[PDB]
């Protein structure tokens, strides 16, 4: 066959996110949730620390 396009596992995207943290603004409440409460909404929490 010709095979014009190749396949991938996960898509990339053209527009991404960046951040500039302030290493002196920490809340003293270490919150917690379930494991499936963690997975779906997980890495998005660690991009908006």
């Amino acid at each position: 066959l010709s095979d014009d396009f190749k396949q991938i596992s996960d898509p990339k995207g053209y527009l991404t996110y960046s951040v500039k943290y302030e290493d002196q603004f920490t809340k003293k409440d270490k919150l917690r949730a379930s494991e499936a409460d963690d997975r779906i909404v997980g890495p998005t929490v660690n991009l908006f620390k």
Binding site: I8, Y14, A33, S34, R39, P43, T44, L47
Partner: protein
């Protein structure tokens, strides 16, 4: 002006097909009532930022 012309070249000569991979399904007992309604039935394995 030349780099913005070149970024328009790469997006034009694209050729990719998305393949469902890794996907897992959670249970209703293991989710908050606020995160439960967001998930249709099965979230794609791996995680997204939003």
């Amino acid at each position: 002006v030349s780099g913005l012309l070149m970024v328009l070249f790469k997006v034009m000569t694209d050729n990719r097909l998305v393949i469902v991979g890794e996907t897992t399904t959670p249970m209703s007992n293991t989710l908050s009532t606020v995160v439960n309604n967001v998930l249709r039935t099965t979230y794609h394995n791996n995680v997204g930022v939003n």
